[PDB]
């Protein structure tokens, strides 16, 4: 059979080093339980404004999060999907 | 809640072995069949060595795991989280826009 094209790999490749970031992973975990302003989001990382909405104003861009203050969302199912699989996987211990 | 700072580096650490496109690929392949790492060889297009040494890491953060038949050890995703988290990354990497 055929593996995926390599361009492809290294697009997934680059996708998942995003999330090789246990700060991001940190957001990421909030957002899965629910939808949240940039305010409730750094009450609960315990820093700023202007830093939250930073590191997701990244996490936009590259298709983990989506917003409408602002609100921040998991972008979709493929992405709640992921992060639990991932999650629940590793809790198997 | 925000998972613990600890759980958040191991979680990290399953990822940075997802971040690589040799891994990646043999991934996709398991993803159809469970295969040994000489099948694996073959279809990349890669020595065997360079198979297992990639292997490796997807063993230890449980990506994969193997069954024995005689003299052939043959290879899978872990489990159906393994399953979910590829399909679901590759379809969110091919979507809409
Ligand atoms: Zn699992
Ligand atoms: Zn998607």
Redesign the interface.
Known sequence: ????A?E??????????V?????R???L??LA?SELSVGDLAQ??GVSESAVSHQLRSLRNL?LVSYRHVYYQL??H??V??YQ??????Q?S
């Open positions: 059979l055929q593996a995926i390599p492809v790999a290294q697009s997934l490749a680059e996708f998942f080093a999330l090789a970031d246990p700060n992973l940190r957001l975990s909030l339980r609960a990382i298709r972008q979709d493929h992405i999907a992921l699989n991932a999650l629940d996987h590793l198997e």
